[PDB]
Amino acid sequence: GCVEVDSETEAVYGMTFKILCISCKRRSETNAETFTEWTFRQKGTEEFVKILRYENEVLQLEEDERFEGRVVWNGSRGTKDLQDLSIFITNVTYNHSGDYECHVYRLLFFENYEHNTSVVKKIHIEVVDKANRDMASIVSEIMMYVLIVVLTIWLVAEMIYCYKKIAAATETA
Amino acid sequence: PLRRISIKILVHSLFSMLIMCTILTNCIFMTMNNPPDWTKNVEYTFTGIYTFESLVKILARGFCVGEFTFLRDPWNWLDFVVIVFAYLTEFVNLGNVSALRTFRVLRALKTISVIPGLKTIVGALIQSVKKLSDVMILTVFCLSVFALIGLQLFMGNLKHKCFRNSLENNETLESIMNTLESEEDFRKYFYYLEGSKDALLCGFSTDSGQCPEGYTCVKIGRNPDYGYTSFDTFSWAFLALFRLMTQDYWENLYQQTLRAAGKTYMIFFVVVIFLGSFYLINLILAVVAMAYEEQNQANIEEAKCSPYWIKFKKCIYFIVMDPFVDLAITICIVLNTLFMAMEHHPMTEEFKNVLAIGNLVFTGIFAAEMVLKLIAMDPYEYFQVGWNIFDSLIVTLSLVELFLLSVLRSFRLLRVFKLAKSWPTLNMLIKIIGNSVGALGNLTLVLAIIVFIFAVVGMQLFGKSYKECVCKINDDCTLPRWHMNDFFHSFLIVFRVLCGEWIETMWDCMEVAGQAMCLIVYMMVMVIGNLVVLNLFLALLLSSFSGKIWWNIRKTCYKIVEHSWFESFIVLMILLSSGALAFEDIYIERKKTIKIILEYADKIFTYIFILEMLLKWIAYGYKTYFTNAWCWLDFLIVDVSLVTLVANTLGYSDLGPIKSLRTLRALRPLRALSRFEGMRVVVNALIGAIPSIMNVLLVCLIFWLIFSIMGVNLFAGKFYECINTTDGSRFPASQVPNRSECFALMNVSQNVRWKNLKVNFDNVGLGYLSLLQVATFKGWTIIMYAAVDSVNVDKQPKYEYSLYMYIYFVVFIIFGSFFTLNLFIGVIIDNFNQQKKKLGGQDIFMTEEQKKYYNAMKKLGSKKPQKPIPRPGNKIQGCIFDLVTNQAFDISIMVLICLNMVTMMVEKEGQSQHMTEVLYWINVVFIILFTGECVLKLISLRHYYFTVGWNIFDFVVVIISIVGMFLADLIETYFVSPTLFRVIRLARIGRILRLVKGAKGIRTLLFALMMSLPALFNIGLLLFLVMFIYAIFGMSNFAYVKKEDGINDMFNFETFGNSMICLFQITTSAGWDGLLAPILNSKPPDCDPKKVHPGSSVEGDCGNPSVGIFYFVSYIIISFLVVVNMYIAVILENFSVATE
Amino acid sequence: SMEVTVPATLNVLNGSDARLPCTFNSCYTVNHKQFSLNWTYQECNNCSEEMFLQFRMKIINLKLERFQDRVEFSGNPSKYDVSVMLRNVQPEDEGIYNCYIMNPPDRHRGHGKIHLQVLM
Ligand SMILES: CNC(=O)c1cccc(Nc2nccc(N3CC(Oc4ccc(F)cc4C)C3)n2)c1
Ligand SMILES: *[C@@H]1O[C@H](CO)[C@@H](O[C@@H]2O[C@H](CO)[C@@H](O)[C@H](O)[C@H]2NC(C)=O)[C@H](O)[C@H]1NC(C)=O
Ligand SMILES: *[C@@H]1O[C@H](CO)[C@@H](O[C@@H]2O[C@H](CO)[C@@H](O)[C@H](O)[C@H]2NC(C)=O)[C@H](O)[C@H]1NC(C)=O
Ligand SMILES: *[C@@H]1O[C@H](CO)[C@@H](O)[C@H](O)[C@H]1NC(C)=O
Ligand SMILES: *[C@@H]1O[C@H](CO)[C@@H](O)[C@H](O)[C@H]1NC(C)=O
Ligand SMILES: *[C@@H]1O[C@H](CO)[C@@H](O)[C@H](O)[C@H]1NC(C)=O
Ligand SMILES: *[C@@H]1O[C@H](CO)[C@@H](O)[C@H](O)[C@H]1NC(C)=O
Ligand SMILES: *[C@@H]1O[C@H](CO)[C@@H](O)[C@H](O)[C@H]1NC(C)=O
Ligand SMILES: *[C@@H]1O[C@H](CO)[C@@H](O)[C@H](O)[C@H]1NC(C)=O
């Protein structure tokens, strides 16, 4: 089923980038009618501008020139119960750096009950020039190497110790 | 002179069989359920014969002495009360005419006294109940203790219902609840998950969940299952715990309680199952077995052209070739059965005529052998042989079909029983089936009489109400599948209650015809019927049973490998590498940090294990390495690990077999079998028993092959129906009568679909699966329903059109499940006893440490009375000493303990505040008087109070009760935690657990449990390792499968918690059909092969039927063998502690 | 027939209050829309029936002139009770009182009949 996974927080210049916003229902059997809207403010500004509004099946992009012709939908297709609102940036620029907001305007459907929910997922990405490897990844790699080498050194130490002891044992006879 | 003729006609087999035949006709008449008008005179002549026999024995016995020697007989009381009731019904009668009509069923109990031997059989049953007494007291005590536990924990949790949020008309919850009563308006305000009778349970905890958006959880309304499933009152808690102890639909209580309260109560259900259900059932079995076996031992020990014709005959006898043609006929029988087994529903006409010519050729061969052997064996000397007369019956029943139905064609299979004289295990099966109607024919007859009595009693009592209005238990206002309106359906219900399926029918029967009467009837059925079935089972079982620096390098490697430091390091790395698999679930694209850490610890672990393997090589030598099963296992696992490592690090390898071998990481826990001696010894026991397992499983495969070929002939392709996919309801069969019409319906509207059952008898493989479901009793009803609805191959099923294939399933259960699992258990206990006699007479599930603890613990069975205590010198202290020591004092203390038990019992959900506070204060005064007797016992025995375990337990429970009340105080003062409040209040049941101190019969069986705890811990280690491996396999494969039935957001294989919960459910075979049902589907529109699954890259929500069937069948079988292991452990330890 | 419990004869003093007690029993749980109760009076055995009280989603008292305002409902039907009260009974109240109960889903219709006699 759905798993709410957070978006990546570093786009690299001139390349592509997919901004995850996955907002799934508490019960997957319910049938909703969801559409989404995205708001975005550049780094160094205090506002929020609507950029694109996904609907039943069509994605309508606003007149913002920063995203003109370089964003395509990447969420659920043909569902009308979207449950996954992630847009794709093609040819990332240095202007795609700021705080995004993923508005999820869900409308669930029950027996005689039509609920109006609204989930706002906020994603902050920062455009860069070269992809920096994760600090967790690099420390885990160096610690794997340290673990391998230290266990090998402990092994060889115990090996040579028992070797000298059994050598003394066979010299005794 | 009238007494003379009276007694002379009394003592007569003619008179005896007259009475037997009239009561048999009366039993056939009792099943009418709506007798015609003319049967009044028939019942009149029945009661006339009864009165005539009664007055005959009166004339022969009493003769004006007051029928003294007559009524000194206990069996004539029955016929006396029967004629009393008959003449009362004939004369002025009560208004409860049907309630006295059901009293004439005792005429079927007259059979027990009329038929020989049945009096002795029921005498033996009554003698065995007198031994079951104490385990019945113990199971009452355990179900009451666990019912108080479940009450404290889940009081009112089952009332949770996801209620609306936006109530218009400015209404409130109470303003709704007072005004809404029909289920449709209940559904318009609560959740009601689209096809359920009850509303969806919700939860306040974070894991239980999960009210949908726009719905908040609140406990308002009735409990689920008409109100009968709850822990609200102590009586409902006791009923739900008896349901857990008999494991009747206990999986639904499991799922409901977990959904309402929280998944963390998996611990409560684990404890309840693995102690109450298993241990108490096996204690019932052990005491029944001991009683019956001592009965049997005491019983047996207290007992003890003519010359051309002759030339033709000699030539034929010479050509029969004694060493060869019998083997030719045996291989012909095997070929004929394996030729009948290749039949399926979709068959080409070529395959059809192939099978036709094949079976006609085979029956021709068998008829030829028949006629040759009759002419060679003289016909008199020929029929001298029972096997040959059976062959004659079979060949006649076969030739009756060549040029002249299905079941008659399904009788060639009995030929495969001819393999018996060559197959010793099949001979044992034949011997069991023959003893069932031989030495135990009277016990089987008593069982049949009991089932008939209960069937007709249930019918007479409840079949009126069922028709009065089913509209309580059914919305179409038609009879349910399991009712009691007919004798056949009432007998089906009684049979289903002989199996463990009483609760689902008890709910409906309660709703229609009163809780008190339905509880009495069903509990009598359960207790008496299961007692007699267990007696028959145990009877059959027991009756059948009885410089050369290279050498220095090798030595250093040897010391390194066998050092305890290195061994503990390897076990630690095994545990780490195993637990590192639990984190790889569908939520692994979150927590990317721990994802990376595990991805590198993977390489670390495989490096460590490669170094371990190379050290073991250099230390042992390839010879002793590759001649070690454990070393071979470790070597195979590290080989798979190394292949995956090199492939992924080399790249160009994420294709097919590589990603299919990555799944074999779930076998990494298997490296702990070699390390943990507790698991190693149980694996050795299973391995030693596996050959006899294979023999008996071969016999069972051949028997179930007979039954599955029969089932394929009966229901091959008849389970197809075209349900309406919106609600999933078969079409009325008046419109849409067959497949060609449903396809026109599917062209007209889109929501219809001609669908199969996915576990059916379409071929012998699916037949084996369906027989496994019917024999485990988990999933059998959905098969039986479509079977008895079957009409033809491409015909829409009609409701109970067959209705007598229920007989096919009854016969299969009785023979296959009952007899073959009897053979299973018997041969497995026999094998374990042979193994135990081989092992010097030692227990085969305990290591050396465990054997030492076992002996030091079995010493606690001391019979020596200790020195009581030295009395003090002080006068007042000596007075207090006798006051504490007096038996009146201790029995008064036990009486106060029972009164405390009752104080906790009268608690319930929804009580008034006055009731709550008076209960508070009664508990407080109980605690204060318990503490008072404790402290006065102390100031009497200051130094020697603590030298006794039960006195230590008394002090511990006093302390924990005091801290429980003080912690309630501190909670009301400082904290808010209802869950912790309940779990702390749980401590007062310690005072109740002190009842065991006086009841020696309960103390001995509890000591048996403590004796069996070590072996049970070893088997639990092995079972938990198997469950872990299967849980990782589940998380890898069966995550992302559809959530169809039995797999839901609460229970699934999505994460390690969910997967281990479903696996603990399945360990008791419960609901494995439901769990396997969404895995078995593929091939849209059963699923979607390319689904997006947001948050992950894996697509498709279909399961692989092959790996699903293998997974679930193998887990069923391995869990069966390990619970058989536990059952052997508890039986043997109870035998030991009972003898001493 | 439906299980309806009433006194076959009810003897009441002129001027006293007469509770006409009847018991109706059927399986299931009563439904307000579903449960309907009707009471009729007759001056004599062969005499035309006059409906004087009904239950149809609530009590309807027809206020027949022959009873003035002396009729009251006196029963909780959910309890299977449908009794009525005739206050300050008069000699002309003598006659036959019929209770008819039709309860869905029960198809059958219950009928209780009371002969009310007025003392002197
Ligand atoms: C009422 N008869 C049954 O239910 C039955 C008879 C024969 C075979 C099975 N099939 C099977 N396959 C795997 C494991 C397993 N387990 C569960 C325990 O067995 C039971 C059942 C019911 C009970 F009250 C107490 C125990 C110990 C051990 N059972 C089931
Ligand atoms: C399958 O069942 C559904 C209901 O479970 C049927 O849908 C109903 O159709 C009728 C007429 O088309 C409508 O008046 C109802 O309002 C519908 N009810 C619902 C709940 O949708 C459907 O017609 C059935 N399929 C067929 C082929 O009859
Ligand atoms: C399956 O059932 C249909 C429904 O009756 C049968 O239809 C036949 O052909 C038309 C279809 O409406 C009917 O007017 C005929 O009366 C039907 N024949 C008979 C003998 O009743 C059809 O024969 C059935 N069997 C199939 C299709 O094999
Ligand atoms: C990006 O931003 C800069 C300054 O904010 C602006 O000059 C430039 O036109 C923007 N890019 C596009 C494509 O409009
Ligand atoms: C996102 O859009 C790109 C097109 O720019 C496409 O290649 C990719 O498959 C899409 N991903 C999803 C998940 O829809
Ligand atoms: C991005 O666009 C620029 C011009 O706008 C172009 O030079 C460059 O090649 C593009 N890069 C990619 C990856 O499309
Ligand atoms: C509520 O639903 C309406 C349409 O029914 C929609 O226009 C509006 O945006 C929704 N608001 C929220 C907060 O969901
Ligand atoms: C509740 O609503 C009703 C009508 O919707 C209104 O008459 C009443 O005043 C309300 N009560 C309160 C306490 O607001
Ligand atoms: C429905 O009938 C038409 C003929 O009118 C046929 O072409 C089509 O394949 C049919 N479809 C189904 C689903 O039966």
Q: Which of B162, B189, B556 to substitute to test the interface with A, most A CBs within 10 Å?
A: B556
Other CB atoms within a 10 A radius of the CB of residue B35 amount to 13
Resolution of the structure in the document, Å: 3.1
Q: Does A66 sit in the ligand 4 pocket, CB within 6 Å?
A: yes
The number of the ligand 6 atom at minimal distance from the alpha carbon of A15 is 13
Q: Which residues touch B1101 (CB under 8 Å, ≥6 apart)?
A: B1040, B1041, B1042, B1087, B1088, B1091, B1093
Q: Does A46 sit in the ligand 4 pocket, CB within 6 Å?
A: no
C-alpha to C-alpha distance for B678 and B1022, rounded to whole angstroms: 8
Sign of CA dihedral A64, A66, A68, A73: negative
- Neighbours of C, requiring at least 3 CB pairs below 8 Å, are B
- Joined together, the tokens standing for residue B1110 give 């293998």
Cis peptide before C105 (omega within 30 of 0): yes
Other CB atoms within a 10 A radius of the CB of residue B854 amount to 20
C-alpha to C-alpha distance for B726 and B721, rounded to whole angstroms: 15
The number of the ligand 6 atom at minimal distance from the alpha carbon of A90 is 14
What CATH number belongs to B308-422? 1.20.120.350
C-alpha to C-alpha distance for B754 and B775, rounded to whole angstroms: 28
Q: Are B986 and B980 in contact, with CB atoms under 8 Å apart?
A: no
Q: Does B737 sit in the ligand 3 pocket, CB within 6 Å?
A: yes
Which strands, in side-by-side order, build the sheet including C59-61?
C9-12, C109-118, C95-102, C36-42, C50-56, C59-61
Contact C27 B181 (CB under 8 A): no
Q: Domain B2-115: which CATH class?
A: mainly alpha
C-alpha to C-alpha distance for B624 and B617, rounded to whole angstroms: 9
Tell me phi and psi for residue A88, to 5 degrees.
-120, 130
| Residue with CA closest to ligand 6 atom 14 | A91
C-alpha to C-alpha distance for B630 and B624, rounded to whole angstroms: 11
Tell me phi and psi for residue A152, to 5 degrees.
-65, -40
C-alpha to C-alpha distance for B408 and B413, rounded to whole angstroms: 11
In 3-state terms chain B splits into helix, strand, coil percentages (rounded to 5) of 70, 0, 25
Give the architecture-level CATH label for domain B875-998.
Answer: Up-down Bundle (1.20)
Terminal-residue alpha carbon distance, chain A? 70
Q: Return the domain boundaries, chain A.
A: 1-173
Q: Are B1030 and B1111 in contact, with CB atoms under 8 Å apart?
A: yes
C16 at B interface, C-beta within 8 A: no
C-alpha distance from residue B1086 to each of B763, B797, B1054, B1076 (Å): 20, 21, 20, 14
**Coil, helix or strand at residue C9:** strand
Going by C-alpha positions, the residue among B714, B896, B716, B902 that lies closest to residue B808 is B714
* B181 contact residues in C (CB cutoff 8 A): 29, 31
A171 at B interface, C-beta within 8 A: no
Measure A6 CA to ligand 5 centroid, in angstroms: 18
Give the architecture-level CATH label for domain B441-545.
Answer: Orthogonal Bundle (1.10)
Other CB atoms within a 10 A radius of the CB of residue B496 amount to 20
Contact A170 B601 (CB under 8 A): no
Which ranges of B716-776 would DSSP assign to H, the alpha helix? 739-748, 764-776
Q: Are B492 and B521 in contact, with CB atoms under 8 Å apart?
A: no
- Cα of C51 to nearest chain B Cα, Å: 29
Sign of CA dihedral B136, B138, B141, B147: negative
**Coil, helix or strand at residue A18:** strand
| Residue with CA closest to ligand 4 atom 4 | A95
C-alpha to C-alpha distance for B530 and B451, rounded to whole angstroms: 11
Measure B93 CA to ligand 2 centroid, in angstroms: 53
In 3-state terms chain A splits into helix, strand, coil percentages (rounded to 5) of 20, 25, 55
Cis peptide before B842 (omega within 30 of 0): no
C-alpha to C-alpha distance for B1074 and B743, rounded to whole angstroms: 29
* C29 contact residues in B (CB cutoff 8 A): 181
Which residue spans of chain B are classified as CATH 1.20.120.350? 2-115, 308-422, 549-668, 875-998
Q: Return the domain boundaries, chain C.
A: 1-120
* Cα radius of gyration (chain B): 34
Terminal-residue alpha carbon distance, chain B? 61
Tell me phi and psi for residue A52, to 5 degrees.
-150, 150
In our burial notation (b when 16+ CB lie closer than 10 A, e otherwise), range B52-62 reads ebbebbbbbbe
Q: Are B50 and B86 in contact, with CB atoms under 8 Å apart?
A: yes
Contact B213 A26 (CB under 8 A): yes
C-alpha to C-alpha distance for B840 and B347, rounded to whole angstroms: 58
C-alpha to C-alpha distance for B481 and B496, rounded to whole angstroms: 12
Per DSSP (E only), the strands in B762-834 are none
- The residue of chain B with its CA nearest to that of A167 is B552
Do chains B and C touch by CB distance (3+ pairs < 8 Å)?
yes
Comparing CB atoms, the residue among B181, B469, B477 nearest residue C27 is B469
Superfamily per CATH, domain B549-668: Voltage-gated potassium channels. Chain C (1.20.120.350)
- Joined together, the tokens standing for residue B481 give 């599948």
Measure A67 CA to ligand 6 centroid, in angstroms: 14
C-alpha to C-alpha distance for B613 and B183, rounded to whole angstroms: 66
C-alpha to C-alpha distance for B554 and B932, rounded to whole angstroms: 70
Contact A158 B192 (CB under 8 A): no
- Cα of B903 to nearest chain C Cα, Å: 32
* B259 contact residues in A (CB cutoff 8 A): none
Q: What angle do CA A15, A19, A20 make, to 5 degrees?
A: 145
Q: How many CA atoms lie within 13 A of B264 on its CB side?
A: 12
Q: Does B168 sit in the ligand 8 pocket, CB within 6 Å?
A: no
Helices B1105-1139, B821-838: crossing angle, 10 deg rounding: 60
Pairing of strands C109-118, C9-12: parallel
Going by C-alpha positions, the residue among B822, B825, B817 that lies closest to residue B770 is B817
C-alpha to C-alpha distance for B992 and B151, rounded to whole angstroms: 15
* Number of CB pairs, chain B paired with chain C, less than 8 A apart: 15
User: Is B66 exposed, middle or buried (CB count within 10 Å of its CB: 0-12, 13-18, 19+)?
Assistant: exposed
User: Given ligand 1 and candidates B1068, B1072, B1130, which is best to mutate, with the most ligand atoms within 8 Å of its CB?
Assistant: B1068
C-alpha to C-alpha distance for B307 and B400, rounded to whole angstroms: 34
User: Is A129 exposed, middle or buried (CB count within 10 Å of its CB: 0-12, 13-18, 19+)?
Assistant: exposed
Q: Does A35 sit in the ligand 7 pocket, CB within 6 Å?
A: no
- DSSP class per residue in B895-946: HHHHHHHHHHHT--TT--HHHHHHHHHHHHHHHHHHHHHHHHHHHHSTTTGG
Going by C-alpha positions, the residue among B252, B238, B20 that lies closest to residue B116 is B20
Tell me phi and psi for residue A50, to 5 degrees.
-75, 135
DSSP summary character for residue B795: B
* B210 contact residues in A (CB cutoff 8 A): 26-27
The number of the ligand 5 atom at minimal distance from the alpha carbon of A77 is 14
Q: Which of C1, C5, C27 to substitute to test the interface with B, most B CBs within 10 Å?
A: C27
DSSP summary character for residue B419: G
| Residue with CA closest to ligand 1 atom 27 | B278
- Joined together, the tokens standing for residue C55 give 């239950």
Q: Are B854 and B1137 in contact, with CB atoms under 8 Å apart?
A: no
Ligand nearest to the CA of B172: 8
C-alpha to C-alpha distance for B181 and B185, rounded to whole angstroms: 7
Ligand nearest to the CA of A104: 7
Residue count of chain B? 1140
Other CB atoms within a 10 A radius of the CB of residue B8 amount to 11
Q: Does B184 sit in the ligand 2 pocket, CB within 6 Å?
A: no
B1002-1140 CATH, one of 1.10.150.120, 1.10.287.70, 3.30.428.10, 3.40.50.880: 1.10.287.70
Q: Which residues touch B685 (CB under 8 Å, ≥6 apart)?
A: B832, B835, B844, B845, B1125
